[PDB]
Design a protein around this ligand. Sequence first.
Ligand SMILES: [K+]
Ligand SMILES: [K+]
Ligand SMILES: [K+]
Ligand SMILES: [K+]
Ligand SMILES: [K+]
Ligand SMILES: [K+]
Ligand SMILES: [K+]
Ligand SMILES: [K+]
Ligand SMILES: [K+]
Ligand SMILES: [K+]
Ligand SMILES: [K+]
Ligand SMILES: [K+]
Ligand SMILES: [K+]
Ligand SMILES: [K+]
Ligand SMILES: [K+]
Ligand SMILES: [K+]
Ligand SMILES: [K+]
Ligand SMILES: [K+]
Ligand SMILES: [K+]
Ligand SMILES: [K+]
Ligand SMILES: [K+]
Ligand SMILES: [K+]
Ligand SMILES: [K+]
Ligand SMILES: [K+]
Ligand SMILES: [K+]
Ligand SMILES: [K+]
Ligand SMILES: [K+]
Ligand SMILES: [K+]
Ligand SMILES: [K+]
Ligand SMILES: [K+]
Ligand SMILES: [K+]
Ligand SMILES: [K+]
Ligand SMILES: [K+]
Ligand SMILES: [K+]
Ligand SMILES: [K+]
Ligand SMILES: [K+]
Ligand SMILES: [K+]
Ligand SMILES: [Mg+2]
Ligand SMILES: [Mg+2]
Ligand SMILES: [Mg+2]
Ligand SMILES: [Mg+2]
Ligand SMILES: [Mg+2]
Ligand SMILES: [Mg+2]
Ligand SMILES: [Mg+2]
Ligand SMILES: [Mg+2]
Ligand SMILES: [Mg+2]
Ligand SMILES: [Mg+2]
Ligand SMILES: [Mg+2]
Ligand SMILES: [Mg+2]
Ligand SMILES: [Mg+2]
Ligand SMILES: [Mg+2]
Ligand SMILES: [Mg+2]
Ligand SMILES: [Mg+2]
Ligand SMILES: [Mg+2]
Ligand SMILES: [Mg+2]
Ligand SMILES: [Mg+2]
Ligand SMILES: [Mg+2]
Ligand SMILES: [Mg+2]
Ligand SMILES: [Mg+2]
Ligand SMILES: [Mg+2]
Ligand SMILES: [Mg+2]
Ligand SMILES: [Mg+2]
Ligand SMILES: [Mg+2]
Ligand SMILES: [Mg+2]
Ligand SMILES: [Mg+2]
Ligand SMILES: [Mg+2]
Ligand SMILES: [Mg+2]
Ligand SMILES: [Mg+2]
Ligand SMILES: [Mg+2]
Ligand SMILES: [Mg+2]
Ligand SMILES: [Mg+2]
Ligand SMILES: [Mg+2]
Ligand SMILES: [Mg+2]
Ligand SMILES: [Mg+2]
Ligand SMILES: [Mg+2]
Ligand SMILES: [Mg+2]
Ligand SMILES: [Mg+2]
Ligand SMILES: [Mg+2]
Ligand SMILES: [Mg+2]
Ligand SMILES: [Mg+2]
Ligand SMILES: [Mg+2]
Ligand SMILES: [Mg+2]
Ligand SMILES: [Mg+2]
Ligand SMILES: [Mg+2]
Ligand SMILES: [Mg+2]
Ligand SMILES: [Mg+2]
Ligand SMILES: [Mg+2]
Ligand SMILES: [Mg+2]
Ligand SMILES: [Mg+2]
Ligand SMILES: [Mg+2]
Ligand SMILES: [Mg+2]
Ligand SMILES: [Mg+2]
Ligand SMILES: [Mg+2]
Ligand SMILES: [Mg+2]
Ligand SMILES: [Mg+2]
Ligand SMILES: [Mg+2]
Ligand SMILES: [Mg+2]
Ligand SMILES: [Mg+2]
Ligand SMILES: [Mg+2]
Ligand SMILES: [Mg+2]
Ligand code: NA
Ligand code: NA
Ligand code: NA
Ligand code: NA
Ligand code: NA
Ligand code: NA
Ligand code: NA
Ligand code: NA
Ligand code: NA
Ligand code: NA
Ligand code: NA
Ligand code: NA
Ligand code: NA
Ligand code: NA
Ligand code: NA
Lengths: 121, 266
Amino acid sequence: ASIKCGSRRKARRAHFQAPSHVRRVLMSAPLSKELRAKYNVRAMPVRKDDEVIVKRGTFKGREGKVTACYRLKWVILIDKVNREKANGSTVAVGIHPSNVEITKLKLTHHRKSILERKDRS
Amino acid sequence: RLSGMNHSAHSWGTGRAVARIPRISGGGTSTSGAGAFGNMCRGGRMFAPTKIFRRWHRKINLHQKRFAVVSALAASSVPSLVMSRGHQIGNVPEVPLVVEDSIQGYEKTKEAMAFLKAIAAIDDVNRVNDSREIRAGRGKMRNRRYVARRGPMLVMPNNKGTRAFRNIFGLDLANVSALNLLHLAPGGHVGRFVIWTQSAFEQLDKIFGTFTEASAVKKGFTLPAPMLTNTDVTRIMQSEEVRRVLKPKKLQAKKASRFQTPTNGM
RNA sequence: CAGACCUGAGUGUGGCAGGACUACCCGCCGAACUUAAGCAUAUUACUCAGCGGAGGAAAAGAAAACAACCGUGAUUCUCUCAGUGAGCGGCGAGCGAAGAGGGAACGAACUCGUUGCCGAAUCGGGUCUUACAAGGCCUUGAGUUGUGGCACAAAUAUCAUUGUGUGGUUGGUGCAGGAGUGGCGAAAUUCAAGCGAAAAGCAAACCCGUUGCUGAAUACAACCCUUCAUGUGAGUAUUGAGCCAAAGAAGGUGUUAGCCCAUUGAGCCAUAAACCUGAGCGCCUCAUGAAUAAGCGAGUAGCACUGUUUGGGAAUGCAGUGUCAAGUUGGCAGGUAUUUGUCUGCCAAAGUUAAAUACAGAGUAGGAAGACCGAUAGCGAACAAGUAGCGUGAGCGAAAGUUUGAAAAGCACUUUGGAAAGAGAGUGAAAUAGAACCUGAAGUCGUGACAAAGACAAUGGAAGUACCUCCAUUUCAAC
RNA sequence: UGGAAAUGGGGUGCCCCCACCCGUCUUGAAACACGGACCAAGGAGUCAAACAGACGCGCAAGGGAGGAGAUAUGGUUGCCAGUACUUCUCUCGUACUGAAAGGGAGAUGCAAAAUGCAUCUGUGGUGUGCACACGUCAAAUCCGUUUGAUUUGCCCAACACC
RNA sequence: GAUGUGGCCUGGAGGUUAGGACGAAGCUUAUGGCGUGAGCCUAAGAUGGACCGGCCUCUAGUGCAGAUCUUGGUUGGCGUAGCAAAGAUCUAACGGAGAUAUACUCAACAUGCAACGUUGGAUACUGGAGCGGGGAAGGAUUUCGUGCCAACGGCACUCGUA
RNA sequence: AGCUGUUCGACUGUGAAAAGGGGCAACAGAGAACCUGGGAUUAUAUUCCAAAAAGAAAUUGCAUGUGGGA
RNA sequence: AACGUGUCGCGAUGGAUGACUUGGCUUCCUAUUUCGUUGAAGAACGCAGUAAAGUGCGAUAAGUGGUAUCAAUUGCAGAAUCAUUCAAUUACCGAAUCUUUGAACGCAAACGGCGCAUGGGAGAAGCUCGUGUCAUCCCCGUGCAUGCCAUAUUCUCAGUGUCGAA
Ligand SMILES: [K+]
Ligand SMILES: [K+]
Ligand SMILES: [K+]
Ligand SMILES: [K+]
Ligand SMILES: [K+]
Ligand SMILES: [K+]
Ligand SMILES: [K+]
Ligand SMILES: [K+]
Ligand SMILES: [K+]
Ligand SMILES: [K+]
Ligand SMILES: [K+]
Ligand SMILES: [K+]
Ligand SMILES: [K+]
Ligand SMILES: [K+]
Ligand SMILES: [K+]
Ligand SMILES: [K+]
Ligand SMILES: [K+]
Ligand SMILES: [K+]
Ligand SMILES: [K+]
Ligand SMILES: [K+]
Ligand SMILES: [K+]
Ligand SMILES: [K+]
Ligand SMILES: [K+]
Ligand SMILES: [K+]
Ligand SMILES: [K+]
Ligand SMILES: [K+]
Ligand SMILES: [K+]
Ligand SMILES: [K+]
Ligand SMILES: [K+]
Ligand SMILES: [K+]
Ligand SMILES: [K+]
Ligand SMILES: [K+]
Ligand SMILES: [K+]
Ligand SMILES: [K+]
Ligand SMILES: [K+]
Ligand SMILES: [K+]
Ligand SMILES: [K+]
Ligand SMILES: [Mg+2]
Ligand SMILES: [Mg+2]
Ligand SMILES: [Mg+2]
Ligand SMILES: [Mg+2]
Ligand SMILES: [Mg+2]
Ligand SMILES: [Mg+2]
Ligand SMILES: [Mg+2]
Ligand SMILES: [Mg+2]
Ligand SMILES: [Mg+2]
Ligand SMILES: [Mg+2]
Ligand SMILES: [Mg+2]
Ligand SMILES: [Mg+2]
Ligand SMILES: [Mg+2]
Ligand SMILES: [Mg+2]
Ligand SMILES: [Mg+2]
Ligand SMILES: [Mg+2]
Ligand SMILES: [Mg+2]
Ligand SMILES: [Mg+2]
Ligand SMILES: [Mg+2]
Ligand SMILES: [Mg+2]
Ligand SMILES: [Mg+2]
Ligand SMILES: [Mg+2]
Ligand SMILES: [Mg+2]
Ligand SMILES: [Mg+2]
Ligand SMILES: [Mg+2]
Ligand SMILES: [Mg+2]
Ligand SMILES: [Mg+2]
Ligand SMILES: [Mg+2]
Ligand SMILES: [Mg+2]
Ligand SMILES: [Mg+2]
Ligand SMILES: [Mg+2]
Ligand SMILES: [Mg+2]
Ligand SMILES: [Mg+2]
Ligand SMILES: [Mg+2]
Ligand SMILES: [Mg+2]
Ligand SMILES: [Mg+2]
Ligand SMILES: [Mg+2]
Ligand SMILES: [Mg+2]
Ligand SMILES: [Mg+2]
Ligand SMILES: [Mg+2]
Ligand SMILES: [Mg+2]
Ligand SMILES: [Mg+2]
Ligand SMILES: [Mg+2]
Ligand SMILES: [Mg+2]
Ligand SMILES: [Mg+2]
Ligand SMILES: [Mg+2]
Ligand SMILES: [Mg+2]
Ligand SMILES: [Mg+2]
Ligand SMILES: [Mg+2]
Ligand SMILES: [Mg+2]
Ligand SMILES: [Mg+2]
Ligand SMILES: [Mg+2]
Ligand SMILES: [Mg+2]
Ligand SMILES: [Mg+2]
Ligand SMILES: [Mg+2]
Ligand SMILES: [Mg+2]
Ligand SMILES: [Mg+2]
Ligand SMILES: [Mg+2]
Ligand SMILES: [Mg+2]
Ligand SMILES: [Mg+2]
Ligand SMILES: [Mg+2]
Ligand SMILES: [Mg+2]
Ligand SMILES: [Mg+2]
Ligand code: NA
Ligand code: NA
Ligand code: NA
Ligand code: NA
Ligand code: NA
Ligand code: NA
Ligand code: NA
Ligand code: NA
Ligand code: NA
Ligand code: NA
Ligand code: NA
Ligand code: NA
Ligand code: NA
Ligand code: NA
Ligand code: NA
């Protein structure tokens, strides 16, 4: 949200000390090719209950549903993206939202207004 | 002005078996009794602390500034000097490169990109593109993170027409009325690749004047007279007029053979 | 006696002062170290410390000013005058301005006292008008021991009367647009090739090249020989094909990203008052423009003794005390004292005033940064830093990067041990990345192997030799 | 064509010879003179102003600002605190002397006026002095010349007397 | 002591030319080559894991062996000096991981030592101006119970004002 | 049960007389109404104890009732 | 022999170097840009389901209200709704709360002390018929420093001050 400037120190301070609502926009993921055509929007901020597919990293190609947008660890949690601990218990692995792509949107009344005002047509 | 000096820090004297340097007062701290106030001491003041009255800026004579710009313009018209500076001009049609004025009506960067390909100025633009990289020192921690080469300079007659050229990476834009020597001779080296718009080219005789006609915009300024009319001193040295007064060539002594010569004359 | 008004108390009612900040600014007070190669005048310095007081600036400011001209014209500031053929100075060390000239700023000007003509027309307080109205009515309450109106050089009347037209700064009332603030708001590949070795190259300016060619990595893993094992995290890299640019902007993301994300712009929406707009525009109310002589700031200015300050020198400002005017050679200034007489400029002893200027250890809310420093540096403080700790106190005042990893996946389980831990096993690309864990130096120490070696302290120089050498180079047939 | 043959380098020991402890004041330090256990990081001719001389550069009897304005820019997050443009000013010179009032520098010719006249293409004169120009000698020539000296003319820059 | 050096080196800047995940800086060296030297370069790392080299110019908080130099760490002395005032403890049982802890040989000694807390006994000291029971100043949870033994109580601890 | 004068309390318009502002400074001076028993704790106790308070008191400040004056 | 010395490989101790940098320093700019008796700055105590410090806040206490925004906060737990407003969370601000002090101002103070006026509150004794009322005691709000200015339906006074009437 207008972080980049001529000063690197000022830009990195604004990013890592961003409030929660600023981190929502910073943690955005691209829409799918079918969602781009339908909504004429390139990307939207990720939210819980969204369906994503991982496009970069070890879990590349793994589909799932967003179960948490931490915003303090700068990651999103996907139900199908997980690993085992030493004792065998299963833990969620956090993926950066820019590494995934949204395949299905969780639509609310205020979410639909964001899509309408971001429409490029 | 108070850095390294914000302590009481009196010296202890000689009766104690320690060096005579100011030492931080008090107790109960690891800093108590520690050397203070000196350039050698940790936490002390630097030698000759820097001040803001340092001479940052310089005065250059107005004629020496105009002389330098005129010299950097002459060097930009020599293809071997432009090549020596690093520019890729092996496909451009002519030097100086002058194009028509219609490029000021371009609205899209695609039109400007196609024009740079036509006059073969894209080789120097591509050279700058491949040269982009992270700066190789502490300057990247400062706001100097990326470096690149220079590339061609496009000179327009006025402020208009630059809309399609602003975003092209590796292309600089200039104004004939205000020509910068820091851009005509980047790094102090003459021979910049300059593309001239036609109307900017015809303005050059009235901005810098002639060897005999004074400049219209620079009051009372004429181009400096050369120290040499011909400047081709090798042609003079090999001319028949010089060669006919040169001292005649003489036959030299035979080169010594591989055998050592006698020295004992007795 | 009452009663008054003069002076002074008490109480009720409505208010104000007080302290903080103090970088800059205004008033006072005020050193010494230091320099003079000593030191006392001088210098430092009209500075530090001390005591008061304001503001967003302060202060100054509308000629009792320069000049000496063909004259300029409030103040403040800048270059310059000028480190001065000014001046001050044990005439030493040193110090040291002003007029003019080029500019910044400038709608820059007003108010009182006095003198003339009036004379309560004034001010508070009640109440009314949508109103603590610059309005009407009332009011002895205050004021005649005088507050208000008119005219005094940018001037030559004002004061009626009807029409004329002006005030958004007279007060009620209410209607716009904008600026400013807040929110929202842009393009284009996560395209293709998959892994120790071609996700690499070569055709030596440009073109050929939208083309041709193809592997010295049958890799390497430690004395070398077999056999069996084990080893490559994530493509912001390379290569090929594209695409956006009025956007190439420099931040994030698991490597170096215009096209993964945020951003980078026109524009859109919403607004207490204030601000800007035929001094924006209506209504009521209230204000308002046009068509005869006289004075002008008194313990003041001067002067005299002191004292201080100044470049100011027979005294540049000022302070104390003494003495103290003129206004019918009127007064002050004209940078060598006096007495004269001519000339020039101005008219002190009340007051207000914006901008240009400072912020030399200040704040509030935001921005731009940098040829700066890079964790013994840069602020004392990159961190629960004016903290922990110290002193009766005034005060003094640190050390310290949590940079493990891409992710905690932070070592389940077995075995020895009381435990701490060890030996295995696991996660991870890597635990010799195992928790204040990136790298991991020097110095010092342990251990294995080896070289030897008397006591010449050891080190050191030059020449050899014995033994070693994961070093380099050369040679290997009529060479 | 090999755990190889040489040559050089590196390592360790040993012989025969050499060989006082570094820094520092000092006439003189191996000193019974002072500072010296080790290592890492840190640590000392700097910035500003006035003047001068050498060297580089521009212009030259003229050189140059400064402050400030103008507009490319009345634009841009930034680049751009830069660059480009201007000055009847100011400054340092072109003239110096005197304490000041004040004065204020050419040559030649003719002549001797207490401001003398005339002309102006011109080193005030003299001695010594690069190059250059006519020659002249000595030496060497590959016979084209070249390298030394030197007479005279003009002497530049300088130096010395008027 | 002066000066010169297309003389060496360091952090940044303007240019230019390169390198890097097939490994950047940094670090290590019997690791060789080049230079008279300051130094440069290569090799190897069974190191590292992301930046950075050459050339010309600009610039500066630009080169360490020592200042009783500053800060941090280390260090021989050195398992050394010592841990000697206030007399002193002994015994059995229990508690405790703190024992009675053994290839072979071997009956037990000659191969698990030394040290704790509690209780009962023994012995002793303080000796009413007391290592007795109160309070002020000062301290401020040290008080009490349970648990606990990493660090601390300069030996020890199972005890403790930890 | 009502009225006049009369003692004591409250209420007000006349007002004798009282000179010398307001405070702090003693946990050893002045002053100060409680002291035994407890089986009441792991740690407090002249502080805790509840009807047989283990209990016995002493003191303030207000009220009600009885008695004596007014 | 042993101590000791050397060289090399490998371990230890120790935290240099490099790379990194939400910090400092320095320069410049923009403003309806300057606190307080309507009680400031500073100091003290407290507030979370869990909470030492720090941060934020004040008994409405890691905060109430309102606007935007649009599904969180996050170590664990709790959580009506999964969300046009009426309950996410952030950001901002008009409405509010704002303990003890401090210029500190009723008087004092190593005292969480003691008042005077005026409104209340609670009152198990007593009176009334568990209802009312309520002495002593206890709790709370407001006012009450000093000085100055203005003021009085024109308040109350003092003076061998000046008069004027007795
Ligand atoms: K100081
Ligand atoms: K320093
Ligand atoms: K100049
Ligand atoms: K590159
Ligand atoms: K790069
Ligand atoms: K470079
Ligand atoms: K009052
Ligand atoms: K001296
Ligand atoms: K004033
Ligand atoms: K002027
Ligand atoms: K109005
Ligand atoms: K409006
Ligand atoms: K890879
Ligand atoms: K890319
Ligand atoms: K980037
Ligand atoms: K005046
Ligand atoms: K006024
Ligand atoms: K400021
Ligand atoms: K930190
Ligand atoms: K890393
Ligand atoms: K010898
Ligand atoms: K000497
Ligand atoms: K170049
Ligand atoms: K390279
Ligand atoms: K060192
Ligand atoms: K040394
Ligand atoms: K040390
Ligand atoms: K002993
Ligand atoms: K035990
Ligand atoms: K006794
Ligand atoms: K006491
Ligand atoms: K009791
Ligand atoms: K360590
Ligand atoms: K470092
Ligand atoms: K707090
Ligand atoms: K009540
Ligand atoms: K009287
Ligand atoms: Mg410092
Ligand atoms: Mg570096
Ligand atoms: Mg002296
Ligand atoms: Mg002296
Ligand atoms: Mg002075
Ligand atoms: Mg002061
Ligand atoms: Mg101002
Ligand atoms: Mg003022
Ligand atoms: Mg003036
Ligand atoms: Mg001058
Ligand atoms: Mg002075
Ligand atoms: Mg008047
Ligand atoms: Mg986009
Ligand atoms: Mg790529
Ligand atoms: Mg990504
Ligand atoms: Mg990496
Ligand atoms: Mg109008
Ligand atoms: Mg007087
Ligand atoms: Mg003086
Ligand atoms: Mg005089
Ligand atoms: Mg006057
Ligand atoms: Mg800048
Ligand atoms: Mg450190
Ligand atoms: Mg520091
Ligand atoms: Mg420090
Ligand atoms: Mg403290
Ligand atoms: Mg003490
Ligand atoms: Mg490590
Ligand atoms: Mg000596
Ligand atoms: Mg001597
Ligand atoms: Mg010596
Ligand atoms: Mg001796
Ligand atoms: Mg000495
Ligand atoms: Mg001269
Ligand atoms: Mg180099
Ligand atoms: Mg540096
Ligand atoms: Mg070695
Ligand atoms: Mg230095
Ligand atoms: Mg020493
Ligand atoms: Mg011993
Ligand atoms: Mg002893
Ligand atoms: Mg003893
Ligand atoms: Mg047992
Ligand atoms: Mg035994
Ligand atoms: Mg006994
Ligand atoms: Mg006794
Ligand atoms: Mg005893
Ligand atoms: Mg005792
Ligand atoms: Mg105890
Ligand atoms: Mg011990
Ligand atoms: Mg008392
Ligand atoms: Mg007594
Ligand atoms: Mg007592
Ligand atoms: Mg008592
Ligand atoms: Mg007790
Ligand atoms: Mg700066
Ligand atoms: Mg202020
Ligand atoms: Mg807390
Ligand atoms: Mg409350
Ligand atoms: Mg709310
Ligand atoms: Mg909501
Ligand atoms: Mg008080
Ligand atoms: Mg007080
Ligand atoms: Na004050
Ligand atoms: Na001094
Ligand atoms: Na001026
Ligand atoms: Na741009
Ligand atoms: Na004087
Ligand atoms: Na080491
Ligand atoms: Na022997
Ligand atoms: Na020896
Ligand atoms: Na040898
Ligand atoms: Na001039
Ligand atoms: Na160096
Ligand atoms: Na030395
Ligand atoms: Na030792
Ligand atoms: Na016992
Ligand atoms: Na070793």
